[PDB]
Amino acid sequence: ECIILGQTMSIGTGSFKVVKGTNISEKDLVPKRCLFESLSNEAALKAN
Amino acid sequence: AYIFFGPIYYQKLKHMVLDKMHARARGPRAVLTRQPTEGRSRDGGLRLGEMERDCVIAYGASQLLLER
């Protein structure tokens, strides 16, 4: 019933999957940030 | 070796190759059409039966199934 619907069978060649590695490091996947939430953090909990 | 030589009454039949070369690329009304004299001789044709679907399962090819 995979040849009727046109699906790939799960035996033989389609018994696995191949995927491609991105080969990227965590040095490029950083949450880059320089003086964004510093203005709103100090003047929100002072004396209140 | 001494080779057996002599005349034999041969005879030429029907069923030449010129009217059996049948091919098809894409779409109906195939481009290489044989002569329309079959006469209770439909031997499958340009098809892919259930016996031939079971052969490529035994090889384990999954994308040739989707291609054919």
Q: How far apart are CA A40 and CA B32, in angstroms?
A: 79
Q: DSSP letters of B16-53? A: -STTT--B--SSSS-SB---S--SS-----S---HHHH
Instruction: Return the C-alpha torsion angle A18, A19, A23, A27, nearest 10.
Output: -140
Q: Solved how?
A: cryo-EM
| Cα B28 versus chain centre, distance | 19
Nearest-neighbour CA in chain A from B51: distance (Å) = 14
> What resolution does the deposited structure have, in angstroms?
3.4
Residue B62 CB: number of other CB atoms within 10 A?
19
Q: Are A2 and A13 in contact (CB under 8 A)?
A: no
Residues in B touching A12 (Cβ below 8 Å): 57, 59-62
Task: Provide the 8-state DSSP code for A32.
Answer: -
Q: Are B68 and B57 in contact (CB under 8 A)?
A: no
Nearest-neighbour CA in chain A from B21: distance (Å) = 30
Residue B46 CB: number of other CB atoms within 10 A?
8
Residue among B6, B4, B2, B38 nearest B19 (CA): B38
Residue among B15, B41, B19, B16 nearest B32 (CA): B19
Residues in B touching A14 (Cβ below 8 Å): 62-63
